[PDB]
Amino acid sequence: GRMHAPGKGLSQSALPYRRSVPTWLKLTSDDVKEQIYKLAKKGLTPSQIGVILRDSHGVAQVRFVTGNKILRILKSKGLAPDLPEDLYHLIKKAVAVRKHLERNRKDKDAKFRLILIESRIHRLARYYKTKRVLPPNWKYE
Amino acid sequence: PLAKDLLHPSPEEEKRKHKKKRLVQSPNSYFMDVKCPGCYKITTVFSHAQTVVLCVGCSTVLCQPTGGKARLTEGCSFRRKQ
Amino acid sequence: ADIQTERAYQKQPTIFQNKKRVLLGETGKEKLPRYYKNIGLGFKTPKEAIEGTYIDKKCPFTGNVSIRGRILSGVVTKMKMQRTIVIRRDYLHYIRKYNRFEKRHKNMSVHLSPCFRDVQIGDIVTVGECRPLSKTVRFNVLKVTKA
Amino acid sequence: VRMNVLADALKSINNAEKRGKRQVLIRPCSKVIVRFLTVMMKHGYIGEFEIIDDHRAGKIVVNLTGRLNKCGVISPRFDVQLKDLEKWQNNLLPSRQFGFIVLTTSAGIMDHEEARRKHTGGKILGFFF
Amino acid sequence: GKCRGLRTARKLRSHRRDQKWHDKQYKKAHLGTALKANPFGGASHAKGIVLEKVGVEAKQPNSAIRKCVRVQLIKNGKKITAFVPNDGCLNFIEENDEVLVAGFGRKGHAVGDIPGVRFKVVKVANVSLLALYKGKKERPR
């Protein structure tokens, strides 16, 4: 089921068997790379970049056409962000809830949900410190 | 019950059954090409799409983001690719 | 001096450092002959030991310590003493009633020769048994392997 | 979450056979399951099976003959010696005439009778009769 | 649910070890609290001096006067009530005699009829009551 919820939701992406590039795809590996770079400069997230490239330009899977993933391409050049996507998003959700809580002292629900977010930050931070993508002195405030 | 070929299910039963609980996984989504009424240039869009997409040819909205599949604008004709 | 920290003079007891030298060799350069021995059980003596200027009577390469008995390993847990480190040894004790194991650790103080420089916490170290050196130290660091 | 995939695989086969289904679906598929099923087939309990290969992690579809009484997993993987094997085949098997304990040994995954023949201990995976 | 893991020997041993205290027999045995409270102090038989003869009434369903003796022990010098066994054995006992008493049979608990007695008289004045009952001996005068 979920991390911090009783729901057993089964809703994710089902990537097809055929890894083969579609015959109708005109864009080449280098052309896609140039597109990813141009998108990345506008200040976007690998998630958003992948969605925009899937919707607009008709690239089913970047890793199939190029042979490398979005964060990996941006890492290889050096247009990758300092904090990983998911940790950054948890921190901005945490500070948003804390900003709400600072006015509302009675909102017990907000306090409970903050505790649940903080737990996700710490559990993800520990993993990133284990893989040595963050420094070992990295704390949360 | 008791005799079904789990190996070779009938293709209509295969399509009905959930995308993740199929014998071999395949997405229900597809890639389709759009022909805008006030333009000559062709564009490709994802069946369940999430961003309002723009045709830079005439600078007009094509498909709308919805709960499921993206609703195309009136006049713009969609056709299945492979 | 660089090597001279204490109240008494530090010097290798085998080495004599007051030979009669003539001016052609005196004014040329200054270098004391450094004593080192090869410990037996296929352990190469580190270059920093045969080249270094450190003075340590408990170094197995450049001191009066003969390595004999058991050769064990351990992981470094505390480097917070003078030329000695606390290492941890993890093992599984088999309980036959249940037919299951329980993990147990032993922390032993080992002497770390000042040759082994820029050695960090967490890496594995192979230690050799020697005569007792302090109250609790009976083992001497022979070689380091990085994590 | 899922731990010891073999446990789910053997439990699935057991329930299917008790219910009287002529085929059973196992997911996911690992070498350990394939070798275990191979040992079960070699002695003539299941017969032919197919490995449906998707790119993620395979599924097995097993033809079931009405022969298998029980197929159990032993968790955790206990350390079994030649001297202790009498005790195990005395405890788990229903008779000394038939039934087999499947050990993973340095030689490979194999039944207890072959383990005695080739003279090597290992880890107990499961039993069937 | 029981933990079955290969490295759970400590958990199982710890649990089994502390859960044995909830057993009535083990706790009464191993904890040195029964022994000091036991009038004999873990001795099969004990010797005492008679205070007085006493008639203890039986339980509700069947009425009778059970003949007994109040005896003060030799080792710890505390008072107990002992039940004389066979018919007319009370006649052979007199006040202020030396008497060997044994446990009744039910491991220091009561009897079917006679309430609040643990002990029974086996010897009187260094002579077995069976011998005085069967007339194989006579009370030393």
Place this chain on the structure above:
RNA sequence: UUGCUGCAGUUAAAAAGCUCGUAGUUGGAUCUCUAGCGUUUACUUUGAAAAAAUUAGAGUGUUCAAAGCAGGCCGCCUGGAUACCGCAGCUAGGAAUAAUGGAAUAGGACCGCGGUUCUAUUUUGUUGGUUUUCGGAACUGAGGCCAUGAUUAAGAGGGACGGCCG
């Protein structure tokens, strides 16, 4: 009726009011040798080491037996065996199973190539002074090659976005 094998917990005695969480335990597919090695263990099989007595057990008519270590043949031919000995520590095979890592701002592997310092203690029959190479190291300025280097994306999990819902 203390349950590791092997017990219970809706009503018989029993699941914390509820969620988070460190230690603890458990953890998804996937990779077919050049006197030094090979990535290191756990596991398993073999070997030496391990006091007798005891226990199992060979031989032996104590008159039988529990025993004992004696005895048997007409000066002789005998016996006083053998096995087990948790764990851990030594020793040599196996490599299924289970942990661990070998190259990701390439100071990565493998090949021949430029130089700085020092040294081996053979050499100009032996002997004193300079310069050497060979034997052997760290530091580097480049070059060629790798089919050059990232398995999959769990009906595991986090996060993103879309239109709702209460």
Place this chain on the structure above:
RNA sequence: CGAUGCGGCGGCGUUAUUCCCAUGACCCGCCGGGCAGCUUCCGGGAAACCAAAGUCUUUGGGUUCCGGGGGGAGUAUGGUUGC
């Protein structure tokens, strides 16, 4: 097995936004996750009953808390928290 709540997917025909589509309200199916219900000799249980309280002598998926005849007793004492 028929309903139901939220979302998605496909499809005759009624209606409203005049009409065409396109959105609502219905109608008939499907898929996933929830609140449940009816039926059943799957199988359990001492039974009452339970599609879990099933897959248990054909006994091992992972892990936490926890009971050991009835009273004494959630009592006495000690510790700790609180005005």
